[PDB]
A paper describes a structure:
Here, we characterize the structure and function of a thermophilic dNDT, the protein from Chroococcidiopsis thermalis (CtNDT). Nucleoside 2′-deoxyribosyltransferase (dNDT) enzymes catalyze transglycosylation via a covalent 2′-deoxyribosylated enzyme intermediate with retention of configuration, having applications in the biocatalytic synthesis of 2′-deoxynucleoside analogues in a single step. As with other NDT enzymes, the active site of CtNDT is formed by residues from two monomers, and therefore, it is only fully formed in the dimer/tetramer.
The structure of wild-type CtNDT was solved by molecular replacement with PHASER. The overall structure of CtNDT is similar to that of T. brucei nucleoside 2′deoxyribosyltransferase (TbNDT),61 as structural superposition reveals an RMSD of 0.859 Å.
Residue numbers in the entry:
A (entry chain A), C (entry chain A): 2 to 154
B (entry chain B), D (entry chain B): 3 to 44, 53 to 155
Write the structure that this text describes.
Amino acid sequence: KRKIIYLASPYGFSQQQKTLLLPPIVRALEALGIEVWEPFARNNQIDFSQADWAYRVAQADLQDVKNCDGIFAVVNGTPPDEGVMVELGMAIALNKAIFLFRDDFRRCSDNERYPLNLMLFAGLPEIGWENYYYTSVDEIQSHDKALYKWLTG
Amino acid sequence: RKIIYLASPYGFSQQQKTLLLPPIVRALEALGIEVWEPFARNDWAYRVAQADLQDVKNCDGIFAVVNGTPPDEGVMVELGMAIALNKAIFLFRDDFRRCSDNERYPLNLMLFAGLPEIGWENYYYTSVDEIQSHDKALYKWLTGM
Amino acid sequence: KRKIIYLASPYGFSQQQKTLLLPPIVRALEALGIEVWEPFARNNQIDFSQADWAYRVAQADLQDVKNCDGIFAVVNGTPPDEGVMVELGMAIALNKAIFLFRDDFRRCSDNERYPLNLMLFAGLPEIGWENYYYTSVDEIQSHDKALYKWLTG
Amino acid sequence: RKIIYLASPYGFSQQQKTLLLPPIVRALEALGIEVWEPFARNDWAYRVAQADLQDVKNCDGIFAVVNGTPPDEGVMVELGMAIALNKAIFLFRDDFRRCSDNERYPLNLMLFAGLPEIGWENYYYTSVDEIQSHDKALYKWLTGM
């Protein structure tokens, strides 16, 4: 009954980023009563002596995306992370809730409407997509943006 | 004819659009495939996004050009949609660089989530001339082997 | 006495790109009478059974950049290639001639003046940098752009 | 004091600027280093470019944060300038992904052009806490070993 957010990000690949950037985002989401599924913690911390470990991580992330209610995708970087992008496309196709996070002020784009490749916004409305687009950790709990509105009906 | 959506970044560069895509299209068409190439098939940005999304919904498989470090973010979104929609999945990379978070695969392990654990290499093409190989997955998919 | 251009690019990493995109660029430069040093052909085609081969390639590229008269840097991609970027910085610091090539229409930038990271343009003039910036292979031989002007005095 | 130019992409992200850079600065400052961090030290775009270029000309060494796939293109330009200007060169990467064209190095081989053939690993730091190691190159450079 508690809504589940899959927190897709590249922050687990860097020690500093994993330790310092992910917990404030997890906490902002948990403070809204969300059950946060963070895949590096949930799925990558495995026995890497097993020949099949990478396949198993992929399948676990896949199943989590299928079972979540929404994705909160950290799309920082030039370009955004290729694994996050796969998960985002999965979420779009599965009609999950979609929320994007980018506090990187660079633009990496093929168009004038969006700060990123237009296909990242294919699951968002033509008008008002900005309401689903978070540019700071402090913005996540805003009652005037889409994540909070989704939680309150 | 089976329909392949040819996802790539090659339309972003004038020279690459002109020279890199037609050999790939020709290779696919020689297997009897109807190729949907989105730069040719294409406010305007939202419309392109919806057109590409509908093409992925309506294809039978995706042939994803995943060259680059990292692979193209738009192609990745389409690959994820294809995986979730149970489309056939084929990957192409003739870029010899590694851009990876693991030792099993040459790329980020999530890109292979739609492929089997054993024999994923059969779906992974590393030259244009490999596309027609009757030992690899595209041929087998077209003929029911 | 013939001027030497170091042709920095990522096109050698892809079979199709190496075979199809590089030769028309080499030919456009050679048609201007330039001696073209293309590092994948010059330096990477080595005995890779030698433990030191990667070190030797790096040193050979380094020496070529030191000995060239100018760099023609293919800065396609989002972002541009990290090895090309190192060579570009080397060329800037060594007061070589600088010419940039990008026919990729995407923008990958931290600013409103330039289509790329502003630091790529640090070796070019504040006003008129566009004269050193080529957006098509057909433009390379233009007598109104900087490469041709450099060759003719 | 020896002057280190701390080249990084971390100023591009609000959270990364706030949380990632100060621990690195602190680690360097504990070795007695004067740290030049360009986002803090900074038409406007050309002026930033010239300021960064002069800082690299005037530093004694560069400490280049080369996280990401690929590493940041601006950092790479500064690294190349530092190599050509005979500055001391130190690399930092706590990103465990490989983005490379070879098997010897974890990154594109050209990034290591300013480092020796044997012992380049001594100049390559893979955690913040490694920065102070008295067995690695930064310490030795500061003390003449």
